Structure formats: structure tokens, C-alpha cells
């Protein structure tokens, strides 16, 4: 009976390993597709944004800098002391 149960355990465990292997392979495929699509989207965004900055560099730089700083300073605690 002990050997019978051991063979039962083997026959039970192996298919679960096969299923997990297929699952992680599909997850890797999904990761590749998602990262390629996100890269394409970011490329399109940067390509569209670039000419507007090239037209008026200083104003766009200042506006983006101010927006980013207000966001980051709002998110964090602040202490203003002289040095």
C-alpha cells in the first residue's frame, strides 16, 4: 500500500507542475507584449511632445519644472531653515 500511495503522489504532483509551467510561460508572454506596447506608447508621447518644446524651450521648461516641484513638495513634509 505504501508504494501504491507513493505512485499516487507522483501522478498527482506532476500535472500541477505542468500547469504552473504553462502559467508562468503565459505570464512571460503577457509581460513581453505589455512592455512592447507601453514602449510604443511612450515613444509616441515623447515624439508628439518634442516639437512643441523645440518651438518654445524656456517657457515649457519653466512650466514643467514648476508643476513637478509643486507636486513633489505637496507630497512630502517640508522644513525651511537657513544654513
Amino acid at each position: 500500500q505504501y508504494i501504491r500511495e507513493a505512485e499516487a503522489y507522483t501522478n498527482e504532483v506532476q500535472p500541477r507542475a505542468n500547469g504552473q509551467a504553462q502559467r508562468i510561460l503565459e505570464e512571460a508572454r503577457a509581460y513581453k507584449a505589455q512592455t512592447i506596447l507601453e514602449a510604443q506608447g511612450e515613444v509616441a508621447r515623447f515624439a508628439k511632445l518634442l516639437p512643441e518644446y523645440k518651438a518654445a524651450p524656456e517657457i515649457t521648461r519653466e512650466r514643467l519644472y514648476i508643476e513637478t516641484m509643486e507636486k513633489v513638495l505637496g507630497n512630502t513634509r517640508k522644513v525651511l531653515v537657513n544654513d
Binding site: 501504491r4 500535472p15 504553462q22 507584449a33
Partner: protein, 106 residues
């Protein structure tokens, strides 16, 4: 009796495990397809967002290049108000600071 019962349980467990493996494979491929469709939609949405941001940037750029310094002043003041709106921070000053120049008796 125990030995035969164990053998039958072995066969049943093997059949159920095979079924579970097939179900897991099907669910995995379904999840992959769902993720691919969502990623495609997200890419299109990112393209639209970038287009909108560039269009807004054009108007900001020209209308603010009309007068850069005053816009910098106003936007910096708005940024100060927005950042310090929360009460979680501590600010240290000095009576010699130019804002408090009126503090001293004239």
C-alpha cells in the same frame, strides 16, 4: 480492503489532477489574452494623452512667452500656496527676514 481503497483513491486523484491541469492551462491562456487587449488599449490611451498634453503645451508656450517673468512669478506663488496648503510641515523664519521688515517699529 485498505490496499484496494488506496488504489482507487489513487486513480481518482490522478483523474482530478489531470482535469485541474487542463483548467489551469486554459485559464493561463485566457489571462494572457486579457492582458494583451488591456495593454493595447492602454497604449492607445497613452497616445491620446500625449496628443492632448502637446496641444495644451502649445497654447501655454505662446500665451506665456507673451510675458515670461510675470508668469513665472504668478505660477511660483500658486505653487507655494498649493504645496504649503497642508498643515503637516514646519517653517522657520527670522525677524531679519525681508517679509517681516514691518515688524520693527518705524
Amino acid at each position: 480492503y485498505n490496499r484496494m481503497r488506496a488504489e482507487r483513491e489513487a486513480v481518482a486523484r490522478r483523474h482530478r489532477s489531470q482535469g485541474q491541469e487542463e483548467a489551469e492551462k486554459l485559464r493561463a491562456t485566457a489571462d494572457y489574452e486579457v492582458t494583451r487587449t488591456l495593454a493595447e488599449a492602454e497604449r492607445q490611451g497613452r497616445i491620446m494623452r500625449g496628443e492632448g498634453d502637446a496641444e495644451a503645451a502649445k497654447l501655454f508656450a505662446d500665451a506665456f512667452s507673451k510675458d515670461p517673468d510675470f508668469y513665472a512669478f504668478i505660477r511660483s506663488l500658486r505653487a507655494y500656496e498649493n504645496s504649503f496648503s497642508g498643515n503637516q510641515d514646519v517653517m522657520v523664519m527670522s525677524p531679519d527676514s525681508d517679509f517681516f521688515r514691518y515688524m520693527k517699529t518705524p
